[PDB]
């Protein structure tokens, strides 16, 4: 049915404006983790972001009306080191898959919008990934294990991808001499 | 001072969660105007929305707490075709500078946080030349003029560049044979 005048279409105003500055925050983030010497983070933050956006234009476009007001608490900034801003983005990401939409999507279904109950479903289990993957970066940080593993395995430059064996990442790529910054575990996905 | 408990802190993060869903609106329009043979607009949109992401930096680094609570009513979406988007942006546009950052600038001041005052002003001035190019663009739309001029020009194919002198954008570009969509007034600002 119509979507005016519902706690469901201000759910997901709220959805969208939280989403919305996500991929702002994940974005500076990026850029700091880039200015912190983890290119690889610094790219995940980039990618996060992006799907923050996407996540945020599929709840706009069930929007249909003009001005509506919000309540609601935000995270007031703060863009620091790059482990503390791994874990403040789990801990957001982290709210919104455990609190957030599982009630959004509860009163979508009480109000009789099955199908954004679903959406709202279903982005959760995206949401409950990303706070995964920021948790083990959080960590390979703080154990030290970023650029270094126990055992010998290989590394991949992602500026040139010249591949590398060892327990370590090279202080810089021979091929194209940029630095240690620049390396990350080789996988294949396919 | 401190910036924590002061209605300073507390206009900072609405504008840095106003200009958050700016940036995704600008972004989905542009992707709309991209769709409706309209390049150059498409552009601007995403420009703009780049824009915002930096206004919205700026502010976001003032910010030093966690969690703030927020009350604030904005444009429950709506993508529409592109002369409505442009329409409904210089508006957005227009409560930016005559309403919201001008109070924003004022209490800051009261409140003694004049380099804050000073950067909401600042803001302001880019917001007000995003609304006229917005408004120029709506109107050489539904004058037609978007392609078309009454006296001869010189138009740029922003795809490879080749200038093409007429009173109207070629059908297609002779030198990439992209469409008339790619072509803009041929402009010089050095
Ligand atoms: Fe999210
Ligand atoms: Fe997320
Ligand atoms: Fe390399
Ligand atoms: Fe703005
Ligand atoms: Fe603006
Ligand atoms: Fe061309």
């Known amino acids: 049915k119509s979507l005016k005048g519902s706690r469901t279409e201000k759910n997901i105003l709220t959805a969208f404006a939280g989403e919305?500055?996500?991929?702002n925050r994940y974005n500076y983030f990026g850029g700091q983790a880039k200015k912190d010497g983890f290119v690889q983070i610094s790219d995940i933050f980039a990618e996060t972001a992006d799907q923050?956006?996407?996540?945020?234009?599929?709840?706009?476009?069930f929007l249909?009306?003009?001005?509506?007001?919000?309540?609601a608490a935000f995270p007031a900034g703060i863009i620091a080191d790059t482990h503390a801003n791994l874990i403040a983005s789990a801990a957001?990401?982290?709210?919104?898959?455990?609190?957030?939409?599982?009630?959004?999507?509860?009163?979508?279904?009480?109000?009789?919008?099955?199908?954004?109950?679903?959406?709202?479903?279903?982005?959760?289990?995206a949401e409950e990934f990303?706070?995964?993957r920021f948790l083990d970066f959080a960590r390979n940080?703080?154990?030290?294990?970023?650029?270094?593993?126990?055992?010998?395995t290989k590394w991949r430059c992602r500026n040139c991808g010249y591949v590398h064996e060892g327990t370590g990442a090279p202080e810089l790529c021979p091929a194209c001499a940029?630095?240690?910054?620049?390396?990350?575990?080789?996988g294949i996905n396919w």
């Open 20 to 23: 919305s500055q996500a991929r």
């Open 52 to 61: 923050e956006r996407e996540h945020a234009k599929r709840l706009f476009k």
């Open 64 to 71: 249909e009306g003009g001005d509506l007001e919000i309540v």
């Open 92 to 125: 957001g990401e982290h709210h919104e898959y455990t609190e957030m939409y599982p009630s959004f999507a509860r009163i979508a279904r009480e109000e009789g919008y099955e199908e954004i109950a679903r959406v709202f479903a279903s982005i959760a289990v």
């Open 130 to 132: 990303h706070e995964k």
């Open 141 to 152: 940080i703080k154990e030290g294990r970023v650029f270094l593993r126990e055992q010998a």
């Open 178 to 186: 940029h630095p240690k910054a620049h390396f990350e575990l080789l």
